[PDB]
Amino acid sequence: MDETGKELVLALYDYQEKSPAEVTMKKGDILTLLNSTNKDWWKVEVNDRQGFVPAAYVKKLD
């Protein structure tokens, strides 16, 4: 209804993208979940950058 996926996830830990395919996120922020069907790298949209983050770093608000 806005992008390919929502679900909402909560950043537990602060994450600095180590690659341009990753995203920089600060814990406490609520991100949009674009992909959670991947076992390792989830896709989230934060600020204006929608890329990958570690599944173990974000929590399901869903």
Side-chain angles (χ1 to χ4, degrees):
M1 62 184 299
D2 58 322
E3 223 293 81
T4 333
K6 182 47 60 65
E7 271 170 70
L8 294 172
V9 277
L10 156 74
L12 308 172
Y13 319 141
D14 54 84
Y15 190 71
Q16 178 52 89
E17 64 191 78
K18 96 191 172 293
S19 63
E22 289 164 51
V23 348
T24 308
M25 72 181 184
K26 278 287 183 298
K27 80 282 201 165
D29 282 285
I30 310 304
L31 332 189
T32 298
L33 230 194
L34 297 176
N35 150 93
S36 50
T37 190
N38 190 26
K39 70 172 174 52
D40 44 72
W41 289 96
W42 285 8
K43 205 176 176 69
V44 295
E45 186 186 83
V46 213
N47 54 84
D48 68 79
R49 187 146 64 251
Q50 55 129 273
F52 289 110
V53 295
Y57 272 46
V58 297
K59 180 178 181 57
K60 295 280 301 152
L61 292 171
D62 169 52

